[PDB]
Design a protein around this ligand. Structure first.
Ligand SMILES: O=c1[nH]cnc2c1ncn2[C@@H]1O[C@H](COP(=O)(O)O)[C@@H](O)[C@H]1O
Ligand SMILES: [Zn+2]
Length: 340
C-alpha cells in the first residue's frame, strides 16, 4: 500500500521551508558553523537530537535552525532540496511558505532572502519545475508573517509579496509561536493583503484562544491551518464559511496538540464533507513525508484507493494557484484517475 500512496499525485499546501530541511543538510551546516566557531557542534547537534518537539519546545528548535540557515546561499540550497524531495514523492503542486528574514550583519533584507528562494527554484535540475506566473512540479510561494512581528514589519512582508507576484507568490501565511502576539497587530496587514487579492492562510487554534479563533474566522481567510483547539461554536462557523483546513497529522500528534489520531478532527471534517487537505507542516522537524501522512490517514479512516484518490484530487480547488494551473492539475489527476 505505501507504494501506491507514494505514486499517488499529491498537493502540498502547508510546508514551512526551514521546517522541511534534510537531517544530513542540517548537520552538515552545524559541523561547518562549528569548525568556524559560530557555535559548539556537540551542543547544537544535541538540541537537534534531544528537543522533544512539544509545542513550546519546537520554537526553541526553530531559533536554532535559523542560526544555522539564515544566509543567502543556504536559503537557495534548502529551497532546492525541499522542492526535490517533494517532487520525488510525486507532489505535483507545492505551496511553500517561508518567513522572509532580515539580518543586517550579512546585508540580508526580506527581499534579498526571497530573491535567494527564487534562486533556489531556478537551480532545481533533478525535476522539471513551473514556478513563474522526469517528474514535474508546480511551485507557488506563501510569505509568512511571524507572530513576533509588528504591524509595520508585517506590512513590509505583504508589500514584498505583491511585488513578487511575477515569480509565483500567491498568498500570505500567519504563523510563529501561537502564545506570542495579538491578532489586532496582524489583522491590518492581512486585510491589506486580502484587499490586494492575495490569498490568506492562517495558523488558527494551535492553542486554546477562543476570542482569537473567532476573530480569525470572522476575517474569512481562504484557508486555515490546524484548528486543534476549536470549540463547537468555532466548528459551526467554520463549516458554514466553508474554509478548507490544512491538516497536519504527525505535527499535531507529536506536539501533543491532539492526543491521538483516533480522535483527530480530520475524521469529523471528512465525514461532514468539509474540505480538508493533508499536509506535512515541517517534514524535517517531524521526520515524515506527505506519503506517510496519507498512509496514516488512509489507515485511520479505512479509505479505499478510489476514496483516497478523490480526497487527494479535492485539494485542487483549495490551492491559491491561477485557473490555468488548476486546469493542468485537473488534467494530471484526470489522467491518473483510472489507475486508482
Ligand atoms: O507548528 C508550527 N506552528 C506555528 N508556526 C510554525 C510551525 N512550524 C513552523 N512554523 C513557522 O515556520 C518557521 C520556520 O520556517 P521558515 O518560515 O522558513 O523560517 C518557524 O520559525 C515558525 O514561525
Ligand atoms: Zn505550520
Amino acid at each position: 500500500h505505501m507504494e501506491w500512496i507514494q505514486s499517488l499525485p499529491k498537493i502540498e499546501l502547508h510546508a514551512h521551508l526551514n521546517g522541511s530541511i534534510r537531517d544530513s543538510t542540517l548537520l552538515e551546516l552545524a559541523r561547518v558553523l562549528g569548525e568556524k566557531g559560530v557555535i559548539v557542534f556537540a551542543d547544537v547537534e544535541h538540541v537537534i537530537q534531544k528537543n522533544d518537539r512539544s509545542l513550546v519546545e519546537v520554537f526553541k528548535l526553530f531559533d536554532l535552525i535559523h542560526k544555522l540557515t539564515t544566509d543567502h546561499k543556504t536559503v537557495t540550497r534548502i529551497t532546492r532540496e525541499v522542492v526535490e524531495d517533494f517532487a520525488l514523492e510525486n507532489v505535483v503542486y507545492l505551496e511553500l511558505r517561508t518567513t522572509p528574514k532580515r539580518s543586517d550583519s550579512i546585508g540580508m533584507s526580506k527581499r534579498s532572502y526571497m530573491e535567494a528562494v527564487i534562486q533556489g527554484l531556478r537551480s532545481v535540475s533533478e525535476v522539471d519545475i513551473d514556478f513563474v506566473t522526469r517528474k514535474k512540479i508546480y511551485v507557488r510561494l506563501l510569505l509568512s508573517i511571524d507572530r513576533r512581528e509588528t504591524t509595520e514589519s508585517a506590512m513590509e512582508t505583504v508589500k514584498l509579496a505583491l511585488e513578487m507576484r511575477d515569480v509565483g507568490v500567491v498568498g500570505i501565511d500567519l504563523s510563529g509561536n501561537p502564545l506570542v502576539g495579538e491578532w489586532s497587530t496582524f489583522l491590518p496587514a492581512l486585510q491589506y493583503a486580502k484587499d490586494n487579492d492575495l490569498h490568506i492562510t492562517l495558523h488558527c487554534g494551535e492553542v486554546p484562544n477562543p476570542k482569537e479563533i473567532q476573530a480569525m474566522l470572522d476575517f474569512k481567510p481562504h484557508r486555515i491551518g490546524h484548528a486543534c483547539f476549536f470549540k463547537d461554536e468555532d466548528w459551526t462557523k467554520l463549516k458554514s464559511f466553508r474554509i478548507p483546513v490544512e491538516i497536519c497529522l504527525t505535527s499535531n500528534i507529536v506536539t501533543k496538540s491532539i492526543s491521538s489520531i483516533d480522535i483527530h478532527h480530520f475524521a469529523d471534517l471528512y465525514n461532514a464533507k468539509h474540505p480538508l487537505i493533508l499536509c506535512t507542516d515541517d517534514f524535517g522537524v517531524f521526520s515524515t513525508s506527505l506519503s506517510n501522512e496519507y498512509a496514516l490517514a488512509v489507515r485511520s479512516l479505512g479509505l479505499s484507493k478510489s476514496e483516497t484518490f478523490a480526497l487527494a484530487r479535492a485539494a485542487i480547488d483549495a490551492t491559491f494557484a491561477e485557473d490555468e494551473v488548476k486546469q493542468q492539475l485537473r488534467f494530471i489527476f484526470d489522467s491518473a484517475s483510472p489507475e486508482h
